[PDB]
Amino acid sequence: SHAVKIYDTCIGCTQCVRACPLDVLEMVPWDGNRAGSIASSPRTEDCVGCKRCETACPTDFLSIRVYLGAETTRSMGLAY
């Protein structure tokens, strides 16, 4: 499976959950921003690695990083 990490630079813009084609991410309550929420990935077994979350993240360098790891049926995106 692929490894998704969220750092402390997040602003809670809600653009990585919407642009994710798999619902890997969800917003949990946080205190480190003004939005009161931080992204999290407890669903990394379902991630394909498509990096649409990293495309739509508006910071300088990205608060979300997905690392390409071990490949499964689900993460190679196979319908067979």
């Binding site: 969800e26 379902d46 049926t73 196979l78 319908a79």
Partner: protein, 103 residues
């Protein structure tokens, strides 16, 4: 038979395509999207072609969860339907909810 719907959900009218389920849906896993529509209307399949769904509860078996979540964003962006719930069906018949996991 091997792709039986849950009770309460009716099948949409689709004429069958070649882009649908493969042997993985028999042996490893398949997926099921279940939504509620207020009328009968025409939606593009995520595996090619077009289908007509009826008023009430409609369920569709797909090979892949991104096929289901692409169908779900099509229903939101076209038909304003947001009560799609996505199940992972194992080959023994077990069904677990994987969207909305929050509720």
């Amino acid at each position: 038979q091997a792709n039986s719907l849950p009770p309460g959900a009716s099948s949409p009218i689709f004429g069958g395509s070649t882009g649908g389920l493969l042997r993985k849906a028999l042996v490893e896993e398949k997926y099921l999207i279940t939504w509620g529509s207020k009328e009968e209307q025409v939606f593009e399949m995520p595996t090619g072609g077009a289908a007509t769904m009826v008023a009430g509860v409609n369920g569709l078996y797909l090979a892949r969860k991104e096929q289901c979540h692409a169908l779900h964003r099509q229903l939101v962006a076209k038909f304003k339907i947001r009560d799609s719930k996505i199940y992972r069906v194992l080959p023994n018949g077990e069904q677990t909810l994987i969207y909305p996991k929050d509720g």
